[PDB]
Design a binder for this molecule. Structure first.
Ligand SMILES: Nc1ncnc2c1ncn2[C@@H]1O[C@H](COP(=O)(O)OP(=O)(O)OP(=O)(O)O)[C@@H](O)[C@H]1O
Ligand SMILES: Nc1ncnc2c1ncn2[C@@H]1O[C@H](COP(=O)(O)OP(=O)(O)O)[C@@H](O)[C@H]1O
Ligand SMILES: [Mg+2]
Lengths: 465, 80, 1411
């Protein structure tokens, strides 16, 4: 048990250290105990490997993709350094050293002596970064739990799922409630009315047993520490209450949630990022709900914007190559752009040539508003050059051309036509370089960097203990 | 503060009936049914060397080390 | 409420409401009446609005009712004055006509509307050219009408100019476009001002179009505000603003300060006929007031801007941000009534909220989350400068504004890429705005031409450049544009500059004339000048020379106030307010302005006033003056005022560096960077000589003087010295001072040494006379270049001097001197002849006792010579090297000078210097210097400032105490800090000692202060002189044991060997406090005497052990650990065996030699067994009688008890104990103190204790020690020292033997009084003030005993005790840091003395303790 014991502190030390880097990354001793009990319901060797697996299965969920892979590389070294050869130890470390900028060398080869390790260096040597990073995850041979799975297994009425501002799992929770047990209630926390209606629907849903959601709490936070902090703590009658689950959405980058409330509630990180085409299809999808105030022509411009927005967002993640810093673009940015588009058509003739100041105003006020660096300001503009001015044929991406509205002029049919142009296309493997006009060589540079960041923070963690 | 100081070192002036301790200025009577305990919440906090040497330091701390001790109890209940 | 109550009360009056209008409108200042009727209102700008209908007023009318009519009519009146005017211009009327009849806000809007209508048509036609020239004409027309206009209408024209310029610019840009699409793009970006010729309700009739979006001009009065110049960037801001609002969103711009975020929000308001309410958030602003304002804004439908929103305190920020959401959410939805501040108040939909976000230390600030989907965030950027420059050139009187603007920018842009990246170089727009500002008066001289531009470029840019960059400027200025051949004002000023310096003593060098020229021309334009350069550049010479030249050229007198900026506090200087009574008293900077501004009783109109800041400049101080540096020219009080500054009143800043100041501060002033020294090394000497000659004319006849100045010229030629000054560098210089700044130390000395022997020059041989001169000049030249050198280096430099001087000319020797007869003229050169001292045993230790050496006399001679020159001396060197004695002996001996000792510490104040002086100085108000502070008695005074490189420095890094001395050395008086005037110090000299600043503790001093000092490095002596010196010390104490008179040399030789070895074996590398010096030797010598003077007749076996005990207590008590302590046992053994060879010695370890006067009547070695028993009987007693605490007496305790005993017995008894904890260092102290019959005072401090508390505790203990004769022991623990000052107090208590600050002023007089009472009582009356104090101090010095108990010396707070010199030098450091195995077992044994145990295996009790 000492051999079980020594490993488990070094594991807890590692999970504890994530809570130092980030506030949401918390772990109690009870959470580790409850996890180790699940491990039961060469004997010692298997029980040990059962621990490493069950810890990776439960605590992988409450971290983001970067820290998933940091914990993977680490936990793998925490096991295999004690278990395997010393020949093994410097070989895998000499590999983690190459991924990081610490050193670049060739590890120890013995024919058939090590095969899993022979396979890993092949990933690192093929300059393929993301694959090498995931190698450590897969070597755990765990089924990596989906938010649903986590929720189902979980035996608590509360959850707080943080996420980057790029996405929101609010819509994932809709399909999660639909697929099992229904009962979905989305509650924005906005202005006294929202909080006031909110606290009413809180006390009543738990007696009723419906699922409830508290959208983007972080903004209405002052209230949380006073009402929600006490309310959720007092509700150990929520144990008594009908099968009901409360959900809270956070933002990782943002105001720090009360730690007591946070540690009491289960934690997840939506990390789930849509492709360009799917975001285009998702932008265009709602747009039919609006009704009709404009011409058939406009729907073409709204389609154009759907593509545009989905292309800047795609680029937002890849920095430095891409944008200089992280910028966040919203449904607000699309809204303010759409409204200027309706306005330019409401003030101008249906002659296509109004195009010139459509770009300036989109690229410098609507979207270039938050942009401060001259470098990035050009990027928004150069995108507008491409997305907006088109005659007859646009070719947004290399696969897809959008032709300008036809003489038939049906507003029904053009929606259906422009939806059809989405359904014809199949998003290539190399989207990030083919569709976003930046080079492939840049994308690899980025892949390298996030590798280096996982590789570093792991080495650092091991030396610290 | 320093004033408790004489109460921490067990220092007194014995008298006709009374046991007096100097606090800051006034010499005050000690009962003897009187007890003293000092409580601290943060182990980051550093206490003065005068206190730390005359004080019986006891750590009621829920450590990482506490996991090693507690895992064996749970392991043995499911092993033997 | 208060203001509201006055208005309801003042209804009777009516007229008294006009005061409050300024507030509740923003635009207007006062209201106009015909008593029953209101004729109109006037704006804060001056502009007078007359209403259409004059509003009638009656008795039974409410303020509420009448004012509500006024708000209505004031807006109506503005539409009337708009349409009246719009219509007129449409009917072809000259804009100069309209100006005189219509309020600006009306004519502005009429312009916009007609402009727009004429350009709107012009886009179809393309007749841009016809309308452009047309507009250009209106521009020129408006411009020249401005020069002949009344100040009020002068604002109106200017404000319109900003607009007309924008009009033409946009037409221009339109004319030029490649296509019609290009033009129709550009036009959409602009604010286009339309009117509805369709509709009713005229205050809604005007609207504004931008980016497709429209915005109703509301008709609020705006007055005539200072209008922001339109830029592309500007329009953009206005464009985002409109784009937020159009979708019912709040505008928010983030970005760095100075990007004019709120000014935009204000400007965007005015353009739409709105006065924006600006909330300056967190200028300690009430939430309750904002909460009111927010309701007011949502009711009135106003626009509100949060000026720098991010800097608000988190609870407030939450509260406010939540409120704002109500408003922004109310509007987005269009809720009729919104609830905010727990009430249903309605919302005008005309309401909007604006937020400016300055960046934090972290980064560019963010909106709270809730506000993110409620506001639109925008990034303000500095304007690309070209565009701003063009306009500015246009306004002045253009010539070719487009060409100049492009060329000016390119040049500035180019300098940036071409010049070196140098600290203070700013080529940003600020700078070009400056060049352009400087241009306006220059145009007056020349033309609205490029040439005037070119002059202004070199007038601002060049005086700031340094020699490499000085040409890049010239190369690229003529490369970019060439203007002129010849300079105006070329002859006139120059002869007034040469004649100034001829008179002043200076040389007109290529550089000095330049930097004089640069200056002259800059005063003219700039009111604030900066002069930066190395100490001894020539600044104080340049400006003092130029200012002087202007009184010859103009005929205008000057009135100069040179203030050392950082000697005084912001409060001492600007104006300080007192915390409870809030009473405003003047200061220094404000006060000298009020002679000029408040009461110009004499001639000030025709005079010029210059206020110089000689000290280092810093943000804190310039920020409190920034308004005078601004276009304002007015001084802003913290409370009470703005004071306006005349054109006469010029502020200069003379300083050595800039690193602390902001680019902002630079660019308001004119900067004059002194690349190198104005003057030639020769030329300096030249002036310096003549400066020195002037002194002598007042004390030496013309015949004498004529002949002595002849001598100087022929003895030293420049050719010789040139090599010598170059060789100066090729040496090690302690307390480094540059060669140029050493010069004054030579010449003053040289002249004094030659003026010295003037009588022997009358009659002596002319060949021999040269030899006396040449020698003195060789000597004065040595100390002034090599005086701060090793002396091992001096001797090297001596040959270097002789080498480069004529070979035959009188050689310099190491100890070289000139000698003359008592009663006869004689000549000869003899050196190194020395007295011998004989002193009795009692005399051996005496605070003033010097055994004259080959080097005592050497130093003392030079040292005294420099004072005769009257140059401040800095004595620099190791501790115990004799700086203090040499200085003290040389002066305790002479009648001429009298010494005052000031000991400096980490944090010494400039009042401390004054307080020390107040005892020995006597202020007299003689009309000769006004106030003077000359020595109290008639003969000269010497302030000796010991540890001058100890005092610390501001957070910027500026020691004011040092600048204060600098002030005294250079300026010769100082400014009185509270009372506010100049007191000129008379006949007081400054001398200082200090350690090498490579040493720890030490702070580097400003060359601006040290340039005024002669620096002499004194090191340690010989190891052979040390041996010689202490022999004579043993000689005196062996008058007590005459049978060992033959033993004094081996004792003296041994004491030095012990010292030499301890110093080498136990260095600061092992432990900090391992710092030894000849003080230790002298300490040992005396320690030996005291043992003899009070011991039984001594055998040689006694004496050596007597010497050995003292040797232990002086050198080894401080030693930590045991490796080193055993090392000393063997060292002492090694030394006795080499110098005192006896087989009568015993165990020399400190455990075996125990010496005491506790058993015997005489100080004798006592028996270990006899002592332990003596302690046992005394500790029970001490335990019973005094606080009950039980302990075991062990071998170490007895050894320690004796340690403290010898300490506590000596006159000044200072011991600091380093004992870890629980060792008992505090308890043994209490004991030994009680045995010695010493009152134990133990400062009663706690978490809440102020300095004043500790002050009290100290004062009493001091007053009881002299005026009650108490004999107290002060135990200070590390815990007691709570603040920095507390330790500073403790230092003053040891280095001096009083605390001056406790007893100052009237509390000085009370002490002084009480002192006289007790002095008489004991049996002497003491006549003078000094006679009594010296008893008081001397009483403390012998009755107060401070023992320090510090537990972890490793700790950085407890480190500072041992660090501090005062404490370290005057204390006996003792080490108790660990319990040794033997002492542990001894203590354990007595504790297990109680025996529950019974016999076992193996001893039983012996084994348990060992475990
Ligand atoms: N034309 C000249 N001829 C001879 N000597 C000169 C001349 N100009 C300057 N000097 C010498 O230089 C010194 C000028 O002192 P000044 O106060 O200007 O130096 P500084 O650079 O301002 O020093 P700090 O920076 O410490 O104020 C004078 O002592 C003078 O001897
Ligand atoms: N010629 C001398 N005669 C007597 N003592 C001397 C002599 N030279 C040096 N000393 C000793 O050296 C020490 C000089 O140090 P100190 O007076 O503190 O000078 P400083 O303050 O510059 O260190 C004195 O304690 C003195 O005993
Ligand atoms: Mg000067």
């Amino acid at each position: 048990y000492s051999i079980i014991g020594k490993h488990s502190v070094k594991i807890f030390s590692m999970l504890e250290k994530f809570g130092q880097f980030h506030w949401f990354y918390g772990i109690s001793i009870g959470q580790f105990l409850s996890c180790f009990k699940r491990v039961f319901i060469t004997r010692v060797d298997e029980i040990l490997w059962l621990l490493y697996q069950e810890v990776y299965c439960q605590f992988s969920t409450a971290l983001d993709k970067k820290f998933k892979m940091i914990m993977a590389m680490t936990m793998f070294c925490l096991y295999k350094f004690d278990i395997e050869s010393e020949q093994y130890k410097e070989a895998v470390l000499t590999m983690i050293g190459v991924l990081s900028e610490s050193s670049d060398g060739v590890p120890k080869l013995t024919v058939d002596t090590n095969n899993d390790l022979r396979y890993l260096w092949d990933y690192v040597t093929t300059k393929s970064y993301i694959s090498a990073l995931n190698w450590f995850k897969n070597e755990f041979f765990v089924d990596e739990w989906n938010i649903a799975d986590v929720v189902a297994n979980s035996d608590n009425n509360y959850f707080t799922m943080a996420s980057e501002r790029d996405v929101d799992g609010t819509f994932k929770l809709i399909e999660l409630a639909k697929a099992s047990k229904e009962s979905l209630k989305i509650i924005p926390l906005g202005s006294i009315e929202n909080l006031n209606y909110a606290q009413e629907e809180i006390s009543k849903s738990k007696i009723e047993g419906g699922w409830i959601l508290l959208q983007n709490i972080q903004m209405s936070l002052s209230w949380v520490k006073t009402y929600l902090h006490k309310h959720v703590e007092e509700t150990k009658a929520a144990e008594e209450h009908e099968k009901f689950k409360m959900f809270m959405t956070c933002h990782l980058t943002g105001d720090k949630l009360p730690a007591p409330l946070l540690q009491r509630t289960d934690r997840f990180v939506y990390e789930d990022i849509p492709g360009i085409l799917d975001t285009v299809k998702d932008l265009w999808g709602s747009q039919f709900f609006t009704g009709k105030i404009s011409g058939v022509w406009s729907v073409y411009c709204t389609f154009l914007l759907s593509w545009f927005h989905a292309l800047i967002t795609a680029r937002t993640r890849l920095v430095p190559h891409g944008f200089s810093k992280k910028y966040y673009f919203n449904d607000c940015d699309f809204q303010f752009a759409s409204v200027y588009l309706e306005n330019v058509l409401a003030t101008n003739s249906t002659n296509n040539i109004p195009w010139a100041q459509v770009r300036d105003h989109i690229a410098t006020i609507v979207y270039g508003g938050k942009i401060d660096e001259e470098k990035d300001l050009e990027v928004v503009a150069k995108l507008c050059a491409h997305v907006f001015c088109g005659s007859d044929n646009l070719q947004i991406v290399p696969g897809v051309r959008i032709p300008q509205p036809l003489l038939q002029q049906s507003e029904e049919e053009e929606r259906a036509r422009l939806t059809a142009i989405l359904s014809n296309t199949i998003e290539p493997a190399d989207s990030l370089s083919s569709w976003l006009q930046l080079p492939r060589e840049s994308i690899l540079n980025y892949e390298r960097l996030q590798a280096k960041e996982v590789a570093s923070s792991t080495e650092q963690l091991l030396q610290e203990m | 503060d320093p004033i408790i100081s004489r109460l921490i070192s067990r220092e007194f002036n014995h008298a006709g009936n009374r046991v007096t301790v100097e606090i800051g200025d006034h010499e005050v009577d000690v009962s003897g049914d009187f007890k003293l305990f000092i409580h601290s919440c943060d182990p980051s906090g550093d206490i003065p060397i005068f206190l730390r040497s005359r004080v019986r330091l006891v750590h009621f701390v829920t450590n990482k080390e506490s996991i090693e001790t507690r895992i064996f109890d749970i392991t043995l209940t499911e092993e033997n | 409420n208060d203001d509201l109550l006055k208005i309801i009360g003042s209804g009777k009056h009516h007229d008294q409401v006009s005061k409050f209008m300024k507030k509740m409108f923003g635009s207007i200042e006062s209201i106009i009446f015909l008593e029953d009727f209101i004729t109109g209102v006037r704006s804060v700008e001056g502009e007078v609005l007359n209403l259409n209908e004059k509003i009638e007023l009656k008795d039974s009318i409410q303020a509420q009712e009448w004012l509500n009519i006024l708000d209505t009519e004031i807006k109506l009146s503005v539409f009337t004055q708009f349409r009246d005017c719009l219509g007129q211009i449409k009917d072809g009327t000259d804009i100069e006509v309209v100006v005189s009849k219509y309020i600006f806000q009306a004519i502005l809007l009429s312009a916009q509307v007609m402009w727009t209508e004429l350009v709107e048509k012009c886009l179809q036609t393309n007749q841009f050219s016809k309308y452009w020239k047309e507009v250009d004409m209106k521009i020129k027309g408006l411009l020249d009408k401005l020069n002949k206009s009344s100040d009020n209408v002068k604002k109106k024209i200017e404000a319109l100019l900003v607009e007309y310029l924008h009009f033409n610019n946009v037409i221009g840009q339109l004319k030029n476009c490649s296509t019609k699409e290009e033009a129709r793009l550009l036009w959409a970006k602009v604010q286009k001002f339309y009117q509805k010729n369709d509709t009713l309700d005229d205050l809604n009739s005007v609207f504004i179009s931008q980016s497709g979006y429209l915005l109703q001009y509301k008709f609020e009065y705006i007055g005539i505000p200072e209008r922001l110049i339109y830029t592309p960037l500007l329009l953009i801001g206005f464009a985002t603003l409109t784009d937020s609002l159009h979708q019912k969103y709040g505008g928010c711009f983030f970005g760095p300060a100075g990007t004019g975020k709120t000014e935009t929000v204000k400007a965007f308001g005015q353009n739409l006929g709105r006065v924006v309410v600006v909330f300056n958030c967190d200028d300690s602003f009430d939430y309750q007031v904002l909460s009111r304002l927010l309701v007011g804004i949502t009711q009135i439908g106003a626009w509100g801007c949060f000026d720098e929103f991010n800097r608000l305190d988190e609870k407030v920020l939450s509260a406010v941000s939540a409120n704002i959401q109500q408003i922004q959410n109310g509007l987005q939805v269009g809720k009729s009534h919104i609830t905010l501040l727990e009430e249903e108040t309605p919302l005008s939909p005309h309401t909007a909220v604006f937020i400016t976000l300055n960046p934090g230390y972290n980064g560019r600030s963010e909106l709270p989350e809730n506000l993110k989907k409620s506001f639109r965030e925008f990034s303000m950027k500095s304007p690309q400068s070209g565009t701003i420059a063009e306009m500015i050139l246009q306004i002045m009187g253009f010539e070719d504004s487009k060409s100049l603007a492009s060329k000016i920018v390119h040049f500035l842009e180019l300098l940036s890429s071409k010049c070196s990246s140098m600290n203070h170089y700013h080529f940003g727009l600020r700078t070009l705005k400056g060049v352009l500002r400087n241009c306006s008066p220059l145009i007056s001289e020349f033309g609205e031409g490029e040439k005037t531009v070119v002059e202004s470029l070199k007038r601002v840019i060049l005086p700031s450049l340094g020699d490499t960059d000085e040409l890049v400027f010239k190369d690229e200025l003529s490369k970019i544009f060439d203007s002129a051949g010849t300079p105006l004002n070329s002859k006139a000023i120059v002869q007034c500059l040469k004649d100034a310096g001829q008179r002043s003593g200076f040389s007109m060098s290529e550089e000095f004339l330049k930097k004089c020229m640069q200056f002259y021309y800059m005063q003219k334009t700039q009111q604030a000048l900066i002069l930066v350069g190395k100490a001894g550049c020539g600044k104080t010479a340049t400006w003092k020379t130029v200012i002087d030249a202007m009184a010859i050229f103009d005929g205008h007198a000057n009135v100069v106030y040179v203030i050392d900026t950082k000697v005084l506090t912001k409060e001492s200087l600007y104006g300080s307010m007192l915390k409870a009574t809030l009473e405003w008293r003047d200061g220094l900077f404000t006060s000298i302005l009020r002679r000029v501004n408040d009461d110009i009783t004499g001639t000030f109109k025709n005079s010029r006033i210059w206020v110089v800041f000689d000290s280092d400049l810093d943000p804190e101080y310039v920020e409190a003056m920034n308004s005078v540096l601004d276009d304002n020219k007015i001084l802003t009080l913290p409370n009470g005022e703005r004071l306006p500054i005349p054109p006469n009143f010029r502020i200069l800043f003379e300083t050595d560096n800039l690193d602390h100041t902001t680019p902002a501060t630079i660019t308001r002033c004119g900067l004059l960077w002194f690349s190198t020294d104005v003057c030639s090394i020769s030329s300096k000497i030249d002036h310096l000589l003549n400066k020195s000659y002037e002194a002598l004319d007042n004390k030496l006849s013309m015949f004498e003087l004529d002949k002595l100045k002849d001598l100087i010229s022929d003895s030293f030629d420049m050719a010789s010295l040139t090599n010598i000054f170059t060789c100066s560098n090729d040496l090690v210089h302690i307390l480094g001072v540059r060669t140029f700044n050493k010069l004054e130390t030579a010449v003053q000395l040289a002249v004094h040494l030659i003026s010295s022997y003037r009588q022997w020059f009358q009659n002596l041989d002319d060949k021999s006379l040269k030899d006396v001169i040449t020698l003195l000049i060789k000597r004065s030249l040595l100390y002034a270049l090599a005086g701060d050198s090793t002396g091992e280096s001096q001797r090297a430099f001596i040959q270097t001097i002789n080498t480069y001087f004529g070979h035959d000319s009188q050689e310099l020797s190491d100890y070289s001197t000139i000698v003359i007869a008592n009663d006869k003229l004689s000549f000869s050169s003899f050196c190194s002849e020395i007295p011998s001292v004989s002193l009795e045993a009692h005399e051996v230790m005496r605070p003033d006792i010097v055994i004259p050496t080959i080097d005592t006399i050497k130093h003392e001679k030079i040292f005294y010579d420099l004072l005769n020159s009257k140059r401040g001396i800095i004595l620099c060197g190791p501790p115990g090297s004799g700086k203090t004695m040499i200085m003290n002996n040389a002066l305790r001996n002479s009648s001429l000078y009298d010494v005052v000792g000031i000991n400096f510490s980490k944090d010494t104040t400039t009042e401390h210097i004054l307080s020390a002086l107040h005892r020995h100085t006597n202020y007299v108000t003689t009309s000769k210097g006004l106030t003077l502070l000359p020595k109290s008695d008639i003969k000269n005074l010497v302030l000796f400032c010991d540890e001058i490189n100890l005092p610390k420095l501001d957070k910027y890094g500026s020691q004011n105490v040092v600048l204060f001395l600098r002030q005294l050395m250079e300026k010769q008086g100082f400014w009185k800090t509270p009372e506010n005037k100049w007191v000129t110090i008379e006949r007081i000299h400054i001398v200082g000692a200090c350690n090498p600043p490579t040493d720890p503790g030490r702070i580097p001093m400003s060359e601006r202060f040290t340039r005024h000092a002669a620096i002499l490095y004194l090191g340690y002596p010989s190891g052979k002189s040390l041996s010689q010196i202490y022999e004579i010390y043993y000689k005196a104490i062996f008058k007590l044991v005459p049978e060992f008179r033959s033993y004094t040399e081996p004792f003296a030789r041994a004491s030095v060997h012990l010292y030499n070895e301890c110093k080498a074996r136990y260095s600061t590398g092992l432990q900090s406090h391992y710092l030894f010096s000849p003080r230790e030797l002298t300490r040992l010598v005396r320690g030996v005497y005291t043992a003899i003077n009070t011991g039984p007749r001594q055998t040689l076996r006694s004496l050596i052990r007597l010497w050995a005990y003292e040797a232990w207590r002086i050198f080894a008590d401080r030693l930590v650990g045991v490796k080193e302590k055993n090392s000393f046992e063997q060292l002492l053994y090694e030394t006795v065996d080499k110098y005192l060879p006896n087989q009568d010695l015993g165990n020399i370890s400190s455990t075996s030699l125990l010496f005491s006067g506790l058993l015997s009547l005489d100080f004798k070695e006592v028996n270990k067994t006899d002592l332990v028993n003596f302690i046992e009987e005394r500790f029970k007693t001490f335990c019973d009688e005094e606080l009950e605490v039980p302990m075991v007496i062990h071998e170490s305790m007895v050894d320690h008890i004796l340690r403290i005993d010898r300490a506590l017995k000596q006159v000044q008894g200072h011991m600091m104990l380093i004992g870890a904890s629980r060792t008992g260092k505090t308890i043994l102290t209490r004991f030994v103190a009680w045995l010695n019959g010493l009152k134990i005072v133990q400062p009663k401090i706690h978490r809440h204790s102020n300095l004043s508390d500790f002050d009290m505790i100290l004062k009493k203990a001091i007053s009881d020690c002299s005026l009650k004769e108490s004999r107290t022991c002060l135990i200070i623990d590390e815990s007691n020292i709570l603040e920095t000052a507390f330790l500073e107090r403790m230092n003053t208590l040891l280095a001096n033997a009083d605390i001056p600050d406790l007893f100052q002023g009237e509390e000085y007089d009370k002490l002084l009084n009480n002192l006289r009472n007790k002095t008489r009582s004991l049996g002497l009356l003491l006549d003078t003030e000094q006679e009594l104090y010296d008893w008081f101090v001397g009483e403390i010095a012998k009755n107060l005993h401070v023992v320090f108990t510090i537990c972890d010396p490793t700790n950085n707070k407890s480190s500072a005790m041992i660090s501090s010199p005062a404490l370290f030098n005057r204390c006996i450091i003792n080490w108790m840091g660990d319990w040794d195995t033997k002492t542990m077992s001894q203590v354990a044994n007595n504790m297990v003395d109680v025996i529950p145990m019974e016999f076992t295996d193996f001893t039983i009790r012996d084994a348990v303790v060992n475990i």
